Amino acid sequence: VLKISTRKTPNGEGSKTWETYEMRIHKRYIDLEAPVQIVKRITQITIEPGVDVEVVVASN
Amino acid sequence: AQHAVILDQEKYDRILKEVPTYRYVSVSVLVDRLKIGGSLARIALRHLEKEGIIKPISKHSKQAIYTRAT
Amino acid sequence: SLVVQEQGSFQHILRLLNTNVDGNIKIVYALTTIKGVGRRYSNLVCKKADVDLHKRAGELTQEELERIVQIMQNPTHYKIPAWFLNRQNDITDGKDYHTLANNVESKLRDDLERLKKIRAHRGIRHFWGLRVRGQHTKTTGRRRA
Amino acid sequence: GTIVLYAERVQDRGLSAVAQAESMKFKLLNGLAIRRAAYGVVRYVMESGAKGCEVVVSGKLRAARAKAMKFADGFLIHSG
């Protein structure tokens, strides 16, 4: 959870009110053993605005 | 500076003959007998235990506590 | 540790290094009433002089005291380091001293003078009876003088 | 070629805050009465079938002293 904690006032007067924004980062991973074909079939599609898909290979 | 810090010969004899009758004996008790500062009082507690008189019925730092032998 | 006895051996108050030291205070801290011997310094001098730090100032054989002073005013020979010392790197002969007793009063004045005499700000600032380490002087320190 | 733009109309602007704000701006700037400009906006948003809508104009018209107005119609909730 990404927190930013600012004063509300753009200046300085007033009882010092504080406010905290937060951006929630959700991260998942799924492990698959598959041939070459399905991988691209599975990566090109299921694509979504908002979700960041990243595919790594290899055992290290 | 105001007394109780050394071992004035008569003092040791005071420490042997004047310590029955103490239902309670500890560091504070030893200082209260117009004698011995806490330090040599603490050395006394150990060396009054060299043999008897005091029964060790409590542990440690800050607090000691002792009772007359039987 | 032990119960001791002693005759008339130990004397209360003893005067070494032109200053008075009370007996019946543990010899390490007893030593500190000398100008230029803080707790650390005394502790090491005593450890270096082959003395028992269970002993008061009062006890101590003349010889033992003899040693202590000797080491105190030559800390370099008797393998006390130098980073242990209040005047490393003089500024004239640039040797490494450890200035003690009546002498530290002098040497403070010596330095305070060298600054004033060379007209450097810290000196001027000293001459004025002000704070010299750069602290804000608006709100703090108003009794003094 | 590794970046690509595509324009696209919006399914009825009437339910878009941002669209209707920029409309007002254009109403006043093109020189319309204030209540006229505000009311037509409210009565088109409503017309585009909203549950409710409110328009504030704060600032100064002609007089030196500044004022505000609320132009509202139909239903709104304000919390949670």
Added chain:
Amino acid sequence: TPVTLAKVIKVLGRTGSRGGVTQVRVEFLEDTSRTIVRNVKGPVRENDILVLMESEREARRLR
């Protein structure tokens, strides 16, 4: 020195402008069948036991 013990029955309420004081009716056990209203300082509930230092001078309102 006479001790006089009374058992609290019914909490009456708060007096004293501040309100720390609570009115209450009691019944002494050493010869019952006789009620008195007292003023208390501490927190009180029913069946608590009060030591009346003197046994006959009940009070009322407190400013």
Added chain:
Amino acid sequence: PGVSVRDVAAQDFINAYASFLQRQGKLEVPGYVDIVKTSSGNEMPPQDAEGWFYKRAASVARHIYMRKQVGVGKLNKLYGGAKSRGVRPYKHIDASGSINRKVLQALEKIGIVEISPKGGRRISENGQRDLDRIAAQTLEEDE
């Protein structure tokens, strides 16, 4: 029965080992000990003077025995505590890595600890050995 060292109260153990290392003679004690301080966050040196190097070594050993591996950087943190910054609030401060590193080097020459892969210092088989022994010694004083 058969014993470990975990079967022994920390202070009862460490003093028992302490005594032993002194009672022994095999060591390597820096020599700056008696003038050094243990941490920049301290005020006075140890009051054990002759000794206490045996104490930390004992402590240091027992610690490493109780874990996989540990280095100078961690011991410096273990042994350090609060430091009065005079009139400014307290702050934790690490202890000195000279004392520690030298303690690890000593214990190893004496063969109670060895270097470890991955990193740091690992308990040694010959440490396991002798620690489990004196622990057993310490439990048999209460028999």
Added chain:
Amino acid sequence: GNEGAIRDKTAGRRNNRSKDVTDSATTKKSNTRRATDRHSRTGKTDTKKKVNQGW
């Protein structure tokens, strides 16, 4: 220069200390105007036409 700065008597803590403290030091906020917040000073005025014509 600096030579002057030390040579200059009438300086340093000693001197100030022996000088009485002014009373502007122990004063107030002064405030000056705030009970006139609502009473407009412009002397001008809008008018019921120009306001109607705009709002």
Added chain:
Amino acid sequence: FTPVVLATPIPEEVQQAQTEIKLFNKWSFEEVEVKDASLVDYVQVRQPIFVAHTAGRYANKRFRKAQCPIIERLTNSLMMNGRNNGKKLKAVRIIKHTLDIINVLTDQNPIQVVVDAITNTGPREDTTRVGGGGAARRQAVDVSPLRRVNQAIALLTIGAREAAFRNIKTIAETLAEELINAAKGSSTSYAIKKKDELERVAKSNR
């Protein structure tokens, strides 16, 4: 008591006194009775306990305060004055010591002696600032049991805390001495003096 051994073993005084009677650090909760009517129901004792430490939800209701064991109340109250806020381990040990000390003097269950000083220092009646017109006199009141217990604890500990401040006697002895002197009010104890002086004034405005 018939002993019992398993792998990692439990010591003799441990096995013995425990399973048998459910007694304190090692003092008896049985016997130990509240010599003043009332104060019972407000001086706990039974359920018995090993030490005076307890993650107890004793605040969230008005009178549940009273169900806490009166020893652990006493120790709870030692741990204050800024520097000592929290520090219950500190406190707990002081009591364990205090009790041992008290035990040495005059025998008696030390926890019982605590009971006596507690009862014996609670103002049977007091006073409060009533209006009546600016010139505010003092109306006499009869103080509740709870206020009588509470106040006793505060008064007892406080007197000792002040005795303990700035002298060689340890905080455990000053507590002990206050307690003992208050076990039957010798009027040489800070608590009784203040109790009795409270009831003096309470009487003279009636």
Added chain:
Amino acid sequence: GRVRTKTVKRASKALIERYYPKLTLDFQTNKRLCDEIATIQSKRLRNKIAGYTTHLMKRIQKGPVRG
């Protein structure tokens, strides 16, 4: 304070009005009835509601209730 809002109390009325046969002195089943028979947008509000239609049910059995 645990005084129920109007939405709840109003929903209890309306329910008891048209489903008195079915419903019960028991909340747990009264709970479940609500899911079937009525639409609510939160678990909380549904409980809220049913616990009160339960309460109302519970003292109807011992004489009428106004409204």
Added chain:
Amino acid sequence: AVPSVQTFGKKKSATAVAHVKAGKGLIKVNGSPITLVEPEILRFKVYEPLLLVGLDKFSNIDIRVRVTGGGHVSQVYAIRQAIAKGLVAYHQKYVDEQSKNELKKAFTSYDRTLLIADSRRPEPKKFGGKGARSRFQKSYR
């Protein structure tokens, strides 16, 4: 495998897991006997279940406790809990009900929340004070 259950205990942010297998009566915590636990003044707080229910009763089992998180008191309240729960967990699956219940009767009738974890938790600080309720000082003039 032998008969075995795992339990845990919590207090503040401490969490103390226990394993109560069948064995010859050991009672270790983190890898040392329960007799070595420390803060020492509170040792009888974690002995507490054992004596509450009869120092035997453990002769057919082994206990290992592993406390991570929390602090130097909360860990003691967490380990005692997991012990007592472990004893009731086991009987529930391997002994019989009555045995289990009698055991719960002893703990509850005494209790420092032995079977049941304290819901108490730290309330968040809010701006304007160094505390959660505590407020920064003010002056007016």
Added chain:
RNA sequence: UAAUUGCGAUAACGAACGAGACCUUAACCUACUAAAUAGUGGUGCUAGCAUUUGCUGGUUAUCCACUUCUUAGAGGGACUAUCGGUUUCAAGCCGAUGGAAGUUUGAGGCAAUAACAGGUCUGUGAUGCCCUUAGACGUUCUGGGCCGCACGCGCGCUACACUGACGGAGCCAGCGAGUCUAACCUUGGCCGAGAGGUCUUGGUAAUCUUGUGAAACUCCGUCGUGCUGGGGAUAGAGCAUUGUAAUUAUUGCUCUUCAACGAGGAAUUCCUAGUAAGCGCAAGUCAUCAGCUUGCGUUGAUUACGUCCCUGCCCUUUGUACACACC
């Protein structure tokens, strides 16, 4: 009632905004879907002690099984439930039981209409008008200044010690954050009294720093009421780090120097449970600098559970020649 929250009375009836609902976070799931970036039991390989099986460790994969603990999806859970007392037996309040949980479950987010000449043109390439515009009020470069010290006022930090200081030893969190066209978080190894230095290393991170082995705290010792070894201001002399730059001492370390302060007048602040108080840590700022803040967990109380005396506000009644509304 926390609530124009409801009950009830009732020329009103039935509703909408705001309150509530809702949302977020902290609490309960041996029920569900899983996990070599979390972890457990078993087994191989292996060390130490005991040996009679035992006890305590090692081994980012030598295999097997599980999901209790950790993680986060989906659900479930509580609705002041059951019972009781009280009340116009109305809404409700109170107690006992059970329960993870029964003070709006705890804490927040959101939050109507209206008022103010509240603050902000010094956040804005938001902005009207006035001013200025080449000897500039544009801009940049060098240097000083915002820190300047008879003094008044506020927030704070550290203290006056023995429920303590010091020295050894025990030894436990939670919220975070970290390096690409770069030099961020730093383990480990050596060197160094320390601060630091140096050689390497892991991590764009549940993977490495880090179990952030934090501090109060606990234990065994020294000291022994003495301005004492409480306290650490002020000042001297040296060593290092950041930076182009440290003088008016950035900060860090070492020796020395060793002030006031012995619980604080009139006054005044904050606070009701994991709260107050004590105690540290991460984050913002940040080249370097926290005695500040925002959050975090650790230790953990005393005392109410009331009232209208003080102070502040809200409501009704009432007067008004005010309505730019007692400025």
